[PDB]
Design a protein around this ligand. Structure first.
Ligand SMILES: *[C@@H]1O[C@H](CO)[C@@H](O[C@@H]2O[C@H](CO)[C@@H](O[C@@H]3O[C@H](CO[C@H]4O[C@H](CO[C@H]5O[C@H](CO)[C@@H](O)[C@H](O)[C@@H]5O)[C@@H](O)[C@H](O)[C@@H]4O)[C@@H](O)[C@H](O[C@H]4O[C@H](CO)[C@@H](O)[C@H](O)[C@@H]4O)[C@@H]3O)[C@H](O)[C@H]2NC(C)=O)[C@H](O)[C@H]1NC(C)=O
Ligand SMILES: *[C@@H]1O[C@H](CO)[C@@H](O[C@@H]2O[C@H](CO)[C@@H](O)[C@H](O)[C@H]2NC(C)=O)[C@H](O)[C@H]1NC(C)=O
Ligand SMILES: *[C@@H]1O[C@H](CO)[C@@H](O)[C@H](O)[C@H]1NC(C)=O
Lengths: 259, 52, 52
């Protein structure tokens, strides 16, 4: 027998994703705006079928590895890794899309910046961040793959663009692939989302001549001994148990269960 | 980028060793009781043989 | 002496094309450049071809 209701664990409230995914939480989906605050938790509670993940279509690279890394994460500190106004004087940061509607108007991710042209030119990009948080920092970006060459020349002013993201433990160069694609959520273009975990005292370098969805807010991750991700439909109420299942919570000293 | 593999290999290595530790310990205690009752039965069947 | 170079290493069970990626990188052991190391295991009676 269980409670049947989702519970807090040892006086610590869980991070309920609600309608969100792991992807929509880290990318900063506009419907997932309540989760983007400095907080700690005992576990992550997620719906089995949640649709508010990546609003713009694309492939989230190593998503299931990010879920395994974030299963043992107890808290984050959301900090602005690259400011939207200070770090980008030569690009127009005000890039929204119709794939991510926020209160029936076009918006974009709250952790990423869609860089476009400014005064008809896309300059070269070289922004470096050195980890001074003394913790693991989850750095999140994206690479925009357009649908035709007209949108590529409109947005980034060159046919051949690249994105190079080099850490000490990360080295990957990205090439936009213009192709005719099926429409997912009204978009024929794709933004491919990537991630890395910065070491303490490590330097990330972002280089691009086009098609970069740059980081705006990063997550300084704190690990924990007991944590996990629980996939449940149970409602969360005020509850202070020590054992938590997806199907409820257990308050007994019996050695076994069958829940 | 192979944390799911590292956790699965750790789960296999720490599950098999726990299962075989439990099997060895359970076998040791069960045949300890069977030995301690076997000796009592051997003394009692000797007493019963001398009685008969 | 060229802008665009390649390394092509083809065996019977190996086929990979390598392209140098010039980028501004953090310095590890005083070097901003990287040598990416690869390996393969030849079969008995197999031919490895190195093209660059
Ligand atoms: C089979 O597939 C292949 C590839 O998959 C096809 O090859 C492609 O064909 C298209 C269509 O012909 C080519 O586009 C042309 O590129 C020319 C050269 O580009 C240079 O000039 C550009 C000028 O930039 C300005 O114009 C563009 C619009 O053209 C604006 O977007 C931009 O903002 C500027 O205002 C430079 O930007 C560029 O870097 C190069 O230096 C263009 O000259 C050409 O424009 C003509 O056509 C326009 C109408 O579309 C017209 O408005 C213009 O005035 C001009 O007359 C056009 O954009 C691709 O380059 C080509 N790719 C490759 C790799 O070859 C192939 O066509 C296809 N075959 C069939 C049968 O379908
Ligand atoms: C969430 O946490 C971050 C820590 O990463 C806070 O950013 C710090 O804010 C203080 C001011 O209160 C500055 O002195 C630090 O330099 C900031 N650190 C950074 C940017 O790495 C952020 O303010 C917090 N947000 C809240 C509490 O709403
Ligand atoms: C969030 O999910 C709802 C329901 O599936 C959907 O209507 C909405 O468009 C989604 N929002 C985003 C930004 O994906």
């Amino acid at each position: 027998s269980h409670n049947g209701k989702l519970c807090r664990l040892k006086g610590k409230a869980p991070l309920q994703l609600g309608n969100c995914n792991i992807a929509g939480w880290v990318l900063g989906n506009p419907e997932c705006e309540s989760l983007l605050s400095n907080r700690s938790w005992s576990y992550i509670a997620e719906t089995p079928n949640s649709e508010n993940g990546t609003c713009f279509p694309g492939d989230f690279a190593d998503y299931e590895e990010l879920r395994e890394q974030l299963s043992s994460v107890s808290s984050f500190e959301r900090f602005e890794i690259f400011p939207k106004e200070r770090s980008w004087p030569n690009h127009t940061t005000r890039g929204v899309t119709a794939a991510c509607p926020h209160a029936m108007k076009s918006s974009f991710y709250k952790n990423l910046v869609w860089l476009t042209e400014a005064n008809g030119s896309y300059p070269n990009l070289s922004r470096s961040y050195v980890n001074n948080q003394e913790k693991e920092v989850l750095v999140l970006w994206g690479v925009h793959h357009p649908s035709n060459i007209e949108d590529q020349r409109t947005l980034y002013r060159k046919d051949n663009a690249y994105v190079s993201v080099v850490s000490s433990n990360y080295n990957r160069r990205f090439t936009p692939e213009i192709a005719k694609r099926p429409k997912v959520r009204g978009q024929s273009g794709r933004i491919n989302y990537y991630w890395t975990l910065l070491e303490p005292g490590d330097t990330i370098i972002f280089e691009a001549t086009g098609n970069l969805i740059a980081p705006w807010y990063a997550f300084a991750l704190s690990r924990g001994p007991g944590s996990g991700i629980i996939t449940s439909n149970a409602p969360l109420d005020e509850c202070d148990t020590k054992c938590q299942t997806p199907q409820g919570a257990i308050n007994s000293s019996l050695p076994f269960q069958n829940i | 980028l192979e944390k799911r593999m590292e956790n699965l290999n750790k789960k296999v290595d720490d599950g098999f060793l726990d299962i075989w530790t439990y099997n060895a310990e359970l076998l040791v205690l069960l045949e300890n009781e069977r030995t301690l009752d076997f000796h009592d039965s051997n003394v009692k069947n000797l007493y019963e043989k001398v009685k008969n």
